[PDB]
Symmetry: D2
Subunit: 343 residues, 4 copies
């Protein structure tokens, strides 16, 4: 028997939000980094992590030139960054929505270990998620982010880790879709270890199949969701070398065997790649000569802002040049999500 989780108006608003995020030429900037991660990236450059420095760095990221307006369609923020204001007086949700962006927020509470496994973790953050998502909906956020961590090892990912992470992702996506917030499913598989394209493609296909079975079990409206996978790439310790079009063929092949075409867009990770190989691999994915019935774009945290952070240097007068760095990468990734990129 059919009891609708969503009225057609809810399905309509979720569909147009998800269509506004992955619009052609546009992608996602991931500024969702919590205090420890931004703290260690500020200690790598040599700046002590305080609240004004974080506000100023995300000010540098968000108040850039308007050439990134048909580049960035969505911005993922932290919980703290929603309630921080720019020096002009506008809050950062208004600063994003002023130039055509969509406000997002990271809503998970980290990873927690699974007992009985070999270093496998599940993820946290389901309690009070309805009230938090309603509050973030009043604060201007239209989509969310939630990250699962899986690793390829000697007998990992096991059935327990894949089943539990898919179940928690589907529960999260149901809670977000009840409040009018587009969920972005991120089943990230770690590039650590020594494994070829074959085992990464196998693991990615099994993980994505279990994720979409869990989404069908939990009555998720697939047109109002986004997918945030990795690119199918070999491990860091793997000695075999692969062309970019081989990685692109493996990625589009693993996506076409699992992902139903009702899903609106696919935004890839950077995932420890360097800043140029992300645009190279995304460009090679968008010229793969297969039929790809969804939006292929980027959701790059580090590969959008690494050069801007390093050319910032922690002092204010470098700002514009730092911003200028970011601008190139944004436009580059825009061409990388249109197949027109050439290094």
């Amino acid at each position: 028997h059919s009891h609708p989780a969503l009225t057609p108006e809810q399905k309509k608003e979720l569909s147009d939000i998800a269509h506004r995020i992955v619009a052609p030429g546009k992608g996602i900037l991931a500024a969702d980094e919590s205090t420890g991660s931004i703290a260690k990236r500020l200690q790598s450059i040599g700046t002590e992590n305080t609240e004004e420095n974080r506000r100023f760095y995300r000010q540098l990221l968000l108040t850039a030139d308007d050439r990134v307006n048909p580049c960035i369609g969505g911005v993922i923020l932290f919980h703290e960054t929603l309630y921080q204001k720019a020096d002009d007086g506008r809050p950062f949700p208004q600063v994003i929505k002023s130039k055509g962006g969509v406000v997002g927020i990271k809503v998970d509470k980290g990873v927690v270990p699974l007992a009985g496994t070999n270093g496998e973790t599940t993820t946290q953050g389901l309690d009070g998620l309805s009230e938090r998502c309603a509050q973030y909906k009043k604060d201007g956020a239209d989509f969310a982010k939630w990250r699962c961590v899986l690793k390829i090892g000697e007998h990992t990912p096991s059935a327990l880790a894949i089943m539990e992470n898919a179940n928690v992702l589907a529960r999260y996506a149901s809670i977000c879709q009840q409040n009018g917030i587009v969920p972005i499913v991120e089943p990230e598989i770690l590039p650590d270890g020594d494994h070829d394209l074959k085992r990464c493609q196998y693991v990615t296909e099994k993980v994505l199949a279990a994720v979409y079975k869990a989404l069908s079990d939990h009555h998720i409206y697939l047109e109002g969701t986004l997918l945030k996978p990795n690119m199918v790439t070999p491990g860091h310790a793997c000695t075999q070398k692969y062309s970019h079009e081989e990685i692109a063929m493996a990625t589009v092949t693993a996506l076409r065997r699992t992902v139903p075409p009702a899903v609106t867009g696919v935004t890839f990770l950077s995932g420890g790649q360097s800043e140029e190989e992300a645009s190279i691999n995304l460009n090679a994915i968008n010229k793969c000569p297969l039929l790809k019935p969804w939006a292929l774009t980027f959701s790059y945290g580090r590969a959008l802002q690494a050069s801007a952070l390093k050319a910032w240097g922690g002092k204010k007068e470098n700002l514009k040049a730092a911003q200028e760095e970011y601008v190139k990468r944004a436009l580059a990734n825009s061409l990388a999500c249109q197949g027109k990129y050439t290094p």
Copy 2:
């Protein structure tokens, strides 16, 4: 760990066979009817069911005019029909392959009831399927057919029936793909009962999701398979009336939320519809203004041959006119799988 079920040459031959079946403009004639079904269709017209009458009727079907050559890309046969010869001396596999067709065979052994359920059945025919599929591969058959039966009722389809039928379908498809035979997955849901488009779409989405999860569990090569679903239509006893484009929107919507685009083609059932509404609904499906990344065509048993059977009359001299009837329907359904059909 990855152990390949198929070498790349096996994947290649399965891919080109499945591409040759659902080639643009082409569809499937289903002459797979067993002795009881063809017996009752011969008693409806008033002909006693004997071996010569069945051979002559399938002779009338298969030796038609050559205008059906870019209409029929595949023919499903019975086990008996593979070893029957035409009056010219050619066997029916040669009679099909002479004009560009691909030979198929129905390989299941019927339905068997599931205990503890309310009139729910599973399907039969897994024992010795490897030797039978190897034998049919030597006899010229390149694809197979297997039919599951599900009904919408007060609490049906239950979880047991959907899980069991998806498991048996995936086991069948693995056994067929080991022998170089393209499996055609047919999860038919019965149009009996009083239910709207909403419940049929819900049931179709749940069934197709469980089927494709079972196919991912059994390491099925999805590019070398075909899907044989129904059109999402209301029940026979349902009093509400629906447009053809509403049925088409419901069907393409239920397909886009479940079926991954690696599947080569989708061949619909007739499913108790009359002979013209099958072409009307298939035409309306092919003009649905959504993105459909697979071949949408027909696999019509009764809706290709009902008028040819009734204009045959059981006597030989009507033959050509009977054949002529079939020819129109074939060409009509060809336009129905290209969106160019107009009644």
Copy 3:
């Protein structure tokens, strides 16, 4: 491959804690009622719900006569009650452990609705559960409590609700067993509605089977857990009448088909029954002439304290008589968990 979730010392301490709780003749008093529930039970008698009244009522419950020492082996508390002191100066964990009791705590965060279902809910409280369980372990609590809610209806409990509640229960039990806290699995099925013994027994068997499959999937040590089911009883609106030994036969039959004998004890609910029928039904369960390879005892919230609450009257001088009421019920339920009870 086997990675142990628990060392043998952890398995040993969990086993002896769970053996100390369901020791022969002993049962569990459930004082775990949160502020709204104790508030409405205090408004039914006519006392305004404040902190001193709750502390005094749980003082009346916990500081009773020492005849309940071989009656109560465990006490479930609220989070607030662990940090409340008696008038003598002892904290309530010390007040429980002084006379042979084991301290427990309710650790869930309530119920949250499941979208797409018909009034089905899952349960909450997984975030930060490791730190909270470590903190409660330092505060003297040796076991936990977590309650799932399922209802029998027209098509409920569905597969989604049973699967999700079993998964959350197994995740909770893994997190509790990592910290040395015995989890008590409570898959309560609501007695609301009109349904016989047959459908309640069917639903109880399906729910318990899915729960124990989820416990086997999550590597739960079954000797260091407890089960908190209901008695298999008809609905409130069901017109058919049943003997007590019929209810007992249905309950022991539904338990014997699902629960493996490694589970240490089974502590039943009261579940909206009146105060005498709980002891009658528990007594009838313990004289069922089947082989019952576990401890059958009680975990009664309302059926231990309803008469003590009503004879308390909200004024202090009734205290001892109120306590005296509780004492009878405790001793009665002790005989009810030994089969020696006679009204």
Copy 4:
């Protein structure tokens, strides 16, 4: 909603048949060996495998002295052996039932490989099983036998093999229970390889949990079934040595965590052990100081008849001495299923 698979009379007759098989002191002789297996055991002694030699060997087994009457409660036969007569004129079902035995039959069709796995097989024999079971029910057979094969390896048993074998076992048991035939579930795990007690116990617990979840999914009446597991023993190539009571503790521990007490009896395999260690291990299992709420007995094919076969020598005049050999082993195993055995 509840639709009963079995009426209470069917449940009653299945319960008394299963109680008559595993009655205290009684066990099962497994003469179910097909033509290749009995052929290679006849070529090991040096007798050419013909129909008269097989009939005479099973005549030697079945027409033994009447001291095995409170030893053997059931005999598993081949399909051929049901229709063979003794020299006295009685058919072998009558020869078994004359002295208190229950006639069984092996009803599977062997093993078939699973594609995509590493040497993992499923089992065959589901087609026409209802008609075959009805026919065997008219021929005097009251129970059945069906054998699944699982092996411990580098990543085996996988999830696919365990899920598929449990599903096929539950389907078989439903079909057998519909016809009034007690199914004996045999999830045999192979002792090949190098693995300790720990990994064999882990694999046995996972396999038995998935088997009983599949039995609960298929509405199997657990009181009218029997379980045929292995003893938890190390591999053949494992260098570590274990006491018999360690093997017994591991076996009873793996059984108590999975098997619900509604199952009537547990009949162990020999499984490549020598003829005395089977009685030693079964005796040690029956003195394990845990609570075992079911019948623990034997189902020994080779460990009942190896000495009788070798002392037979293929010539008739040794017969009685050969029979005498068998008699000792039967009585020994009877004491081994009562804990009173002493070598």
